[PDB]
Amino acid sequence: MYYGISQFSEAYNKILRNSSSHSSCQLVIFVSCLNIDALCATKMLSLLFKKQLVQSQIVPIFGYSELRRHYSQLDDNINSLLLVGFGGVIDLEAFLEIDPQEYVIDTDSGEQSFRRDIYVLDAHRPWNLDNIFGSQIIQCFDDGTVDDTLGEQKEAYYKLLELDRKQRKKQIHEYEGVLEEYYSQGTTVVNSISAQIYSLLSAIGETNLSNLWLNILGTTSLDIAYAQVYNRLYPLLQDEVKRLTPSSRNSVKTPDTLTLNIQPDYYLFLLRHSSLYDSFYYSNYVNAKLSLWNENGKKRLHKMFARMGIPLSTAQETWLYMDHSIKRELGIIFDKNLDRYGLQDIIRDGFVRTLGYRGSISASEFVEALTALLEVGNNSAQKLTNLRKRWVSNFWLSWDALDDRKVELLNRGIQLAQDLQRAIFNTGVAILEKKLIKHLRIYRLCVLQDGPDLDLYRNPLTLLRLGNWLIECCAESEDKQLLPMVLASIDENTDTYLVAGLTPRYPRGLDTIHTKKPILNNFSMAFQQITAETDAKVRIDNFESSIIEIRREDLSPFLEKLTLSGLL
């Protein structure tokens, strides 16, 4: 372990001592864009440092190349660096060309001090042992995994470090085997950065309703792909909401009251900001459980609505103007008429925040709006950089959406979320009708070669959204065995693909012994190994490890070698 849960306050105090000078701005926060959890964590840090008047700079970085370029550009005065959402799975001192002898001051006296401190803050579990164990400059905000599940790796790393006959060589190979089996592991996510920073705030005592709301947003960002993590962290948020809500309950509503509530939040898509029919129709879970992509699915949906006794005219009405008779009986109606179709998991408990008279909104809807703003908010090596520039710019739109004074931007985000879900649904029914997903014995490939609005999928977030749609659809099919999926999308302007190796997941709400063990995404190591040999102009720079940009002509040989690769 490097920084446990109980000693986050030590890191915060170290940051304050090193860089809380009003003379200059010696603190720089590197945030990974295209990550809602990192966005909420950086918003928390921004508010916390605004309270203590610690001058700081927030830089959205898209890829590892940008991180390296910025660090090279980074001045030596800046003596505190925060990496939010990345950096925990690579040799940062090696990647950034860091040698501790050039950053050490006042070596003496069993202590050491350095002129610059890098605090990595992410949730991807393959901690690089040369970062968590063998470097003092790099300081990792651990969540308790290393101090409990890395004892063997700690011993193996230290023995090899200190040792630089037959028994000695045999034991070295035995220890080196322990390190090797630690690697060759898929990259998962166990915690949410927002929850970690909220734990730090609880240690410092700066918790309030806005920070709790940011924590809820960051945690709810994990419910789509890491539902086990969200279910693990949910009781803590539930306790915090009860702790922070004022005792003056059942009071009259006033234009100033902000209420965090735990009320039934059905697992539909933008239920409060769109019609009930559109909430069922465009839901990922409902689509998986009913197969609405085919023609018979719409008939099933209409039959369900008739069964509940909700007229289609009322069902398609906007949620605000739905008749108060139906809107107040949603719980009873869903209890009576959902287990018939297997949608019992739709009913759920979530967090809903109302700001005075501005109407309710749930964290699930809020994160969809934020994601939409990230995705569509606003010869070959140059236009791609223009895309990176636009993608960085969208981070600030999603950042400004968090402010309560910019609801006119959150509504635009909601509209963009509805449009993007519509486009995702159209492309999904186009893929599943033409049977574009080629089943294999290693990975179910799927390449998007032509169609409409194909420029949406050059963004990694939109491609992951489509992949999550497909994976949710496949997960509820019993015949289809679990298998990694690959999505690609040709970028005509740059003549390059965007391969996004995904991971399968068990059906939502299905809790078993094998469900408890998380599924690990093995595509990162496979991609890196394939790129190391057989130079193919592959661009592996995303913080999301399992996403690469490959030339149009080099895609097929790359996939051939990947098929020959048994790593994944």
Binding site: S202, A203, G205, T207, D239, K242, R243, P246, S248
Partner: protein, 433 residues
């Protein structure tokens, strides 16, 4: 054998649960502690007023603590039944510890206290068990049943109540290396709620259930003067507390009277005073407006009230029956009394406790100037009645000689030629004194 026999736990400025999950364990001068149930157990939250020296924190709680006590160096938690106490210093250099108190049949911890020299735990039976900062026991003693506790930096003040001995207080200064005692089981003049507890009260029954004796707080002063607040809504200070023979219980504030005289004329009952601390006429107290005596989770701003003697007579105050007018004849006399008591209190800490802020001498000099100004006004008022003996008697308490010269001028101007010679004789006597 009931009602007052219930030694239900009490902590300074406590609060009942009432009709919600929020409860205030303690409101010291340095912060407050609140508890909320997470539908199965409590989560403690400790906040501090002097943000800049401490940092608030909240932790999960499983034992369901009922007692708390905040110092400038650490806070102590207690339990009513099976009273496992917990002490946690604010700084991380000192490690917090927990201990289990010896519990007997019918026993229940009533109050807890802590001091940088020793930590003291109460007991319904009347035990006086004490430990060091780190939990090692030091001595076990039995006294009258302790019902409340409040400690300053080095001194501990407790009130003992029993159905046979009555309300008896005891102010003991443990000291760094000398356990110098100042009082022991001495009778106290606090009025226990008896008539008001005879099934005639609205919304006060729940609070009286929370605290049977109705004593709201036992906060000290900035100079170590013990103070008492309860149902009678009057502060009780110990003026000459250094000498046990010089024990003095002076009612320094009258909450109901002050509230009435600032409310415009109505005898309002919807205003309740929750004192926190007093520091040289600065009484910090939350003024809750409503039918609920205890405050809510958003603790209101600690509005400050000034000390006022209960010399205000209703007969004199209803001269303008309905900015309540004050009789100028009695207002100056009350200012005289306030200046007198404040000067006496400051002199005790001047030579003994030394300088505290570097301005005690100057404020004492200004207070003495006001003290003699009040004497001059009373002298003029007596001269207005053509009572030369009254003015002569009042002139013997003058401190500054310049005020005595002003008294000479008053005598020579207020149609009293005979007073001139006597005040001049007093001044000439003061020449050699």
């Amino acid at each position: 054998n009931t009602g007052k026999f219930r030694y239900m736990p009490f902590s300074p400025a406590g609060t009942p649960f009432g009709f919600t999950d929020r409860r205030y364990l303690t409101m010291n001068e340095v912060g407050y502690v609140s508890t909320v149930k997470n539908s199965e157990q409590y989560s403690i939250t400790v906040s501090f007023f002097d943000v800049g020296r401490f940092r608030e924190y909240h932790f999960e709680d499983l034992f369901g603590y009922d007692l708390c006590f905040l110092n400038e160096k650490g806070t102590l938690f207690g339990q009513s039944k099976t009273g496992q106490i917990q002490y946690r210093p604010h700084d991380s250099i000192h490690s917090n510890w927990t201990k289990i108190i010896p519990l007997q049949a019918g026993e229940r911890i009533t109050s807890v206290a802590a001091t940088p020299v020793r930590v003291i735990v109460g007991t319904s039976l009347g035990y006086f068990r004490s430990f060091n900062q780190f939990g090692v026991p030091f001595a076990v003693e039995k006294t009258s049943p302790i019902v409340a506790l409040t400690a300053q930096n080095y001194r501990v003040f407790s009130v003992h109540y029993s159905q046979f001995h009555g309300l008896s207080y005891s102010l003991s200064e443990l000291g760094t290396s000398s356990k110098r005692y100042y009082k022991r089981e001495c009778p106290l003049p606090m009025s226990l709620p008896n008539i008001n507890s005879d099934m005639k009260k609205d919304a006060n029954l729940d609070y009286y259930n929370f605290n049977p004796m109705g004593i709201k707080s036992l906060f000290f002063s900035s100079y170590g003067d013990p103070c008492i607040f309860g149902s009678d809504n009057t502060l009780l200070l110990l003026s000459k507390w250094r000498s046990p023979e010089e024990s003095k219980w002076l009612p320094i504030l009258d909450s109901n009277m002050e509230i009435w005289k600032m409310s415009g004329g109505k005898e309002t009952t919807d205003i309740h005073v929750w004192p926190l601390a007093l520091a040289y006429d600065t009484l910090n107290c939350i003024l809750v407006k409503g039918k609920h005596i205890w405050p809510e989770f958003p603790l209101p701003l600690p509005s400050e009230m000034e000390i006022r003697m209960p010399v205000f007579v209703k007969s004199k105050l209803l001269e303008e029956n309905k900015e309540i007018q004050i009789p100028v004849s009695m207002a100056a006399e009350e200012e005289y009394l306030r200046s007198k008591v404040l000067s006496e209190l400051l002199t005790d800490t001047l030579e003994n406790d030394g300088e505290m802020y570097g301005n005690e001498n100057e404020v004492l000099a200004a207070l003495n100037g006001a003290y003699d100004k009040a004497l001059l006004r009373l002298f003029a008022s007596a001269c207005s009645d053509q009572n030369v003996e009254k003015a002569l008697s009042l002139a013997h308490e003058l401190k500054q000689d310049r005020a005595l010269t002003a008294a000479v001028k008053i005598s020579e101007r207020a149609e009293l030629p005979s007073l001139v010679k006597k005040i001049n004789n007093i001044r000439e006597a003061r020449y050699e004194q």
